[PDB]
Amino acid sequence: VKEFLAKAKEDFLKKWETPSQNTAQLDQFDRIKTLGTGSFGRVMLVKHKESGNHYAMKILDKQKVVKLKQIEHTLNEKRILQAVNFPFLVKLEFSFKDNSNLYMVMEYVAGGEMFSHLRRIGRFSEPHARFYAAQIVLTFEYLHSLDLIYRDLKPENLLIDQQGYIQVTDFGFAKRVKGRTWTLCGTPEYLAPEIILSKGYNKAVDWWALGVLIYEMAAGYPPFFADQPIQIYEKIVSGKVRFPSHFSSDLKDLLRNLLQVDLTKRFGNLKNGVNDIKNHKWFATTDWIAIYQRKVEAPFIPKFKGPGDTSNFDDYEEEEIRVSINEKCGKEFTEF
Amino acid sequence: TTYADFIASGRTGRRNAIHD
Known part of the structure; x- marks a missing residue:
C-alpha cells in the first residue's frame, strides 16, 4: 500500500x-441531457463529435460561482481532478472555459x-x-x-x-x-x-x-x-x-x-x-x-441499455447553456 | 418507526451542499 x-x-x-489547461472547446460536444443539478451549476451528458464517445460535462457559471464565494473551491476542484488517478475516482478528461462558464468534461458513469x-x-x-x-x-x-x-x-x-x-x-x-x-x-x-x-x-x-x-x-x-x-x-x-x-x-x-x-x-x-x-x-x-x-x-x-443510456438518472429540466459576447469573470479564473 | 419518520421528513431528496 x-x-x-x-x-x-x-x-x-x-x-x-x-496542471493541464484548456484541453477542449465546446464546439466538439453535443449536448444531450442534464444528469444532475447542484448548488453552483449542472452536469450534462455530452457526446464528443470527433470520437463519438460520451462524457459528463460539469458546467459552472462564473458569476454564480463568484456570488456564492466559490472562486477558490472551483480551482481546487479542477486542480485536484486533473492531478489524481485512482480506480474509484472519476477521471477528468478535458477542462476549458469561455466568456460565461467553466467546464470540466469527465467520463460518463451510466450506472446512476x-x-x-x-x-x-x-x-x-x-x-x-x-x-x-x-x-x-x-x-x-x-x-x-x-x-x-x-x-x-x-x-x-x-x-x-x-x-x-x-x-x-x-x-x-x-x-x-x-x-x-x-x-x-x-x-x-x-x-x-x-x-x-x-x-x-x-x-x-x-x-x-x-x-x-x-x-x-x-x-x-x-x-x-x-x-x-x-x-x-x-x-x-x-x-x-x-x-x-x-x-x-x-x-x-x-x-x-x-x-x-x-x-x-x-x-x-x-x-x-x-x-x-x-x-x-x-x-x-x-x-x-x-x-x-x-x-x-x-x-x-x-x-445499461447501451450507449448513452440515461435511464439510471432522474429527469431534470433543461436550461440552455448560453455564453456571453463579453468575457465575464476574467481575472479570477485565469488559472482554470 | 424511524424509517417511517425519515420518509415523511422533507429531506428524502438530493440534499444540497451548504457553502456557508
Missing part, C-alpha cells in the same frame, strides 16, 4: 505542479448515483454496504495520503459504474492542506461536529462522514436527520446515536468508532491510521487487494 502510495505521490505532484438505488431498494444488506465501504476506506486512504481532504461524501456523489463499482465525483470542496482548515462546507447530515462547532478540522472529518455513509447505506436513513439543517446539527453535536436492531455487533462497534465526537479517540484519526479500520471485525471478509483490483464480484449491477 505504502509502496504504491509513494509512487502515486510522485505523479500527483508532477500534475499538481503543472448510489443515492437513487439506496432510496429505491430501501437499504443495503451489510455485505453490500461493506462492498461499497471498502472502496471508500481505500479511496480515502489514497486521497488523504496526498494531503487531500474530500469534504462531501454522500450518496448523491458516489456514481455506480458498469461493473457495480464506485466512482467518487464532485471534488468541489476537496482541498490540499497539510494541517488545519476552517471552511464550513459539506452537506448538513454529513458534517463532523468539529465543523459545526468551528474548531478547525482536518482529514478526520472524512472518517466521520464515512461512518455516516455506512449507517445510511445499511439502515435506509442518516443517523441524524431532521427538517431543518439547524435541527440536524443540534443532533450531530450531542452525538447520541441510536442503531437499528438489524445491525451486527461488529457494525455497531465500527460505527461506534467512526461517529466518535472526540477526534482523539476517532477511528482513522488514531495511531494505526486507516489500519484500525481495515482490520476491525466488520471487514474481516474484506480482501482489500481484490477490491482494489476490481475482481470482487459486484453485488448489484445496473442494466
Whole structure:
C-alpha cells in the first residue's frame, strides 16, 4: 500500500505542479441531457463529435460561482481532478472555459448515483454496504495520503459504474492542506461536529462522514436527520446515536468508532491510521487487494441499455447553456 | 418507526451542499 502510495505521490505532484489547461472547446460536444443539478451549476451528458464517445460535462457559471464565494473551491476542484488517478475516482478528461462558464468534461458513469438505488431498494444488506465501504476506506486512504481532504461524501456523489463499482465525483470542496482548515462546507447530515462547532478540522472529518455513509447505506436513513439543517446539527453535536436492531455487533462497534465526537479517540484519526479500520471485525471478509483490483464480484449491477443510456438518472429540466459576447469573470479564473 | 419518520421528513431528496 505504502509502496504504491509513494509512487502515486510522485505523479500527483508532477500534475499538481503543472496542471493541464484548456484541453477542449465546446464546439466538439453535443449536448444531450442534464444528469444532475447542484448548488453552483449542472452536469450534462455530452457526446464528443470527433470520437463519438460520451462524457459528463460539469458546467459552472462564473458569476454564480463568484456570488456564492466559490472562486477558490472551483480551482481546487479542477486542480485536484486533473492531478489524481485512482480506480474509484472519476477521471477528468478535458477542462476549458469561455466568456460565461467553466467546464470540466469527465467520463460518463451510466450506472446512476448510489443515492437513487439506496432510496429505491430501501437499504443495503451489510455485505453490500461493506462492498461499497471498502472502496471508500481505500479511496480515502489514497486521497488523504496526498494531503487531500474530500469534504462531501454522500450518496448523491458516489456514481455506480458498469461493473457495480464506485466512482467518487464532485471534488468541489476537496482541498490540499497539510494541517488545519476552517471552511464550513459539506452537506448538513454529513458534517463532523468539529465543523459545526468551528474548531478547525482536518482529514478526520472524512472518517466521520464515512461512518455516516455506512449507517445510511445499511439502515435506509442518516443517523441524524431532521427538517431543518439547524435541527440536524443540534443532533450531530450531542452525538447520541441510536442503531437499528438489524445491525451486527461488529457494525455497531465500527460505527461506534467512526461517529466518535472526540477526534482523539476517532477511528482513522488514531495511531494505526486507516489500519484500525481495515482490520476491525466488520471487514474481516474484506480482501482489500481484490477490491482494489476490481475482481470482487459486484453485488448489484445496473442494466445499461447501451450507449448513452440515461435511464439510471432522474429527469431534470433543461436550461440552455448560453455564453456571453463579453468575457465575464476574467481575472479570477485565469488559472482554470 | 424511524424509517417511517425519515420518509415523511422533507429531506428524502438530493440534499444540497451548504457553502456557508
